């Protein structure tokens, strides 16, 4: 039941070499389904909560999904959807403010 992290510990050895030498071998038993912890410490001091980490992960996703749609594909129907959604949300928030301005 020896774990994979205390099995191989050395220099780069590009991933396929490790796959060939350690786990693709048929003589192995394939125990040790223990994953590892990949999130760093410099990313926990500033986002110290799964909620805050998820919010930041969503903010950067919403930004990337704007930078890619801003060689001449020029239609990229996802881009037209993302422009229609923004131009709809703008009008909707403006009318939501204006209506309650009028209700007084």
């Amino acid at each position: 039941l020896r774990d994979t992290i205390p099995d191989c510990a050395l220099r780069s050895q590009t991933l396929e070499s490790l796959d060939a030498r350690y786990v693709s071998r048929d003589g192995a038993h394939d125990a040790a389904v223990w994953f590892e912890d990949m999130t760093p410490a410099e990313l926990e001091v500033v986002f110290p909560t799964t909620d805050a980490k998820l919010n930041y992960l969503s903010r950067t996703q919403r930004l990337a999904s704007l930078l890619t749609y801003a060689t001449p594909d020029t239609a990229c129907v996802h881009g037209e959807l993302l422009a229609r959604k923004r131009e709809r949300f703008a009008a909707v928030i403006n009318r939501f403010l204006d209506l309650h301005q009028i209700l007084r």
């Binding site: 040790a32 389904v33 223990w34 994953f35 799964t50 009008a91 909707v92 009318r95 009028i102």
Partner: protein
């Protein structure tokens, strides 16, 4: 109950305790696994799939499991049984085991609640009695119609929240499963929890065939809960039928009743739930109002008073006929209400949308612009006189003339529109009717449009650099030209005035009229799309001289628009907007 009795599954992990959470059935997982409904809604259903009894999995569900939720191939189970985790942290094994077994003990304690045993004895007994189509079996199928399932959901989701309050989330999920409607937004399931809901079933569709089994099984399963009931003409058939079925599929020694009055079902204890009948005129919790279109006063007072209670759900299941479909007592309620009454109709709003709900009809018994867009349109109007910076500097005016008098289709339509942000806004409307036998119909029409424009100009001074005017010439080219000429001259008393011009076929002349033909379908198509998405609105200070002595101009326009499938104003509005090839000076 099988998935509740599972051992620890040691299952070591690397995430710090400051993040990990305890999902039931499984060990301790990172907090992200509680935010993703992809895994949460699976680890939550494979567990509640054990509380659901074996008589509520379906007709064909598998041997001894809900095979469409818990099925592992005979090769994947043998390849999974050889998977082994880190299995431990000796200083950290005991707390995780304690937490997991504590959550599972909470679940098991939920399994043993008497009030939950009653809800099970209700839903299981109902799905079992329904197998025989509610015959007199002591205890080809009896499929429920749609509303005959909505009534059951309305009763069960209420009595669940009333009898079992300390288990809101768990019983909510259990009922979502048992009705075979999982992945339902909690807004709908919450709507099921409401009281005082109204039904409207057509006769001979089945309302008493389903009520008396509902009444009988809401009596015999639950304990100590009364059940109201009221009708105008003295309920005797339903009462005798309830007596019959209860004495049939339960011990007749248990039922005790006096004719036309309280029926009571016995129990080992002194629970003795009752069906006291209020037809002949405390805590009821059902108050099944069986007829709600024929009530006499001094009998509505008990119903208005029971609304003051917090445990009664007055169900207004009342029949309709379609000869009196617009009941003087309920069909008006659909005006000012929100998720209160649900009609059971097969010929919907229009004269013949029946082909839509045709397949929905019982087998035994054998609008271009959306309303929301119209309500939003009239409901919200932007103030143009104070948001002039949002407007484009061009006005577009379309005149759709009719050159007759003393006719209902003799109205001239005029619209003055512009761009507002990237949307379109109406500044003025006219529905103008020639005085009979005037000598100057074009000038009368011109004076009407000029007066409208002027008012719009005065309300927004300095806003507009251009006004572009189209006079439809389909009716008469000469008469359209005459209108343009009078508009031209009168406006000569700043913004530049430009007319749309048309070079008629075979001609080299550019006339100041507009010919409506090939551009109609694109114009209408674009309008419908824009209007429906909230992109066309009316100015809060919209101008109209001709619609100022009987109805609101926007309300009037909307009545014409709702004929899309006298149209002068609709055409002018749609075409003015379409206009907003180059028109010129």
């Amino acid at each position: 109950g099988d998935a509740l009795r599972v051992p620890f599954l040691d299952f070591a992990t690397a995430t710090p305790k400051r993040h990990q959470t305890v999902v039931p059935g499984v060990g301790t997982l990172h907090d992200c696994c509680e935010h993703s409904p992809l895994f949460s809604a699976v680890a939550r259903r494979l567990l509640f799939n054990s509380l659901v009894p074996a008589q509520l999995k379906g007709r064909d569900f598998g041997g001894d499991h809900t095979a469409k939720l818990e099925f592992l191939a005979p090769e994947l189970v043998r390849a999974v049984a050889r998977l082994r985790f880190k299995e431990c942290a000796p200083a950290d094994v005991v707390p995780q085991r304690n937490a997991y077994y504590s959550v599972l003990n909470t679940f098991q304690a939920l399994h043993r609640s008497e009030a939950f045993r009653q809800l099970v004895h209700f839903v299981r007994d109902f799905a079992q009695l329904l197998k025989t189509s509610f015959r007199a079996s002591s205890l080809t199928y009896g499929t429920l119609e749609l509303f005959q399932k909505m009534i059951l959901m309305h009763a069960t989701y209420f009595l669940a929240a009333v009898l079992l309050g300390d288990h809101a989330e768990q019983v909510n999920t259990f009922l979502r499963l048992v009705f075979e409607i999982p992945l339902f937004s909690d807004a709908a399931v919450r709507h099921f929890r409401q009281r005082a809901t109204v039904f409207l079933v057509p006769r001979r569709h089945g309302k008493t065939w389903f009520l008396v089994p509902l009444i009988a099984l809401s009596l015999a399963s639950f304990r100590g809960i009364k059940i109201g009931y009221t009708a105008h003409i003295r309920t005797e058939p339903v009462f005798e039928e309830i007596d019959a079925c209860l004495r049939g599929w339960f011990g007749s020694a248990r039922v005790d009743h006096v004719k036309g009055e309280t029926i009571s079902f016995s129990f080992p204890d002194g629970s003795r739930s009752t069906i006291v009948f209020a037809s002949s005129h405390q805590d009821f919790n059902l108050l099944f109002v069986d007829e709600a279109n024929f009530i006499r006063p001094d009998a509505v007072q008990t119903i208005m008073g029971f609304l003051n209670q917090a445990n009664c759900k007055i169900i207004f299941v009342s029949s309709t006929n379609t000869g009196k479909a617009s009941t003087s007592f309920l069909y008006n309620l659909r005006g000012a209400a929100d998720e209160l009454l649900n009609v059971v109709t097969y010929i919907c709003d229009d004269h013949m949308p029946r082909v839509v709900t045709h397949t929905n009809a019982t087998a035994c018994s054998c609008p271009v612009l959306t309303k929301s867009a119209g309500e939003r349109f009239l409901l919200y109007r932007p103030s143009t006189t104070t948001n002039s910076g949002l407007m484009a500097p061009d006005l577009y005016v379309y005149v759709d003339p009719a050159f007759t008098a003393n006719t209902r289709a003799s109205g001239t339509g005029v619209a003055v529109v512009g761009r507002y942000r990237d949307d379109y806004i109406i500044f003025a409307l006219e529905h103008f009717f020639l005085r009979a036998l005037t000598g100057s119909a074009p000038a009368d029409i011109a004076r009407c449009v000029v007066h409208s424009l002027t008012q719009v100009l005065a309300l927004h001074p300095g806003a507009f650099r251009g006004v572009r005017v189209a006079v439809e010439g389909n009716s008469s080219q000469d008469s359209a030209v005459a209108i343009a000429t009078h508009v031209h001259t009168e406006m000569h008393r700043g913004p530049e005035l430009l007319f749309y011009h048309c070079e008629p076929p075979g001609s080299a002349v550019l006339y100041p009229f507009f010919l409506l033909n090939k551009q109609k379908t694109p114009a209408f198509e674009h309008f419908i799309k824009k209007f429906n998405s909230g992109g066309v609105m009316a100015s809060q200070e919209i101008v109209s001289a001709t619609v100022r002595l009987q109805t609101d101009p926007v309300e009037y326009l909307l009545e014409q628009l709702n004929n899309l499938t006298s149209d002068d104003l609709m055409v002018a509005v749609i075409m003015a907007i379409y206009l907003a090839g180059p028109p010129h000076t």
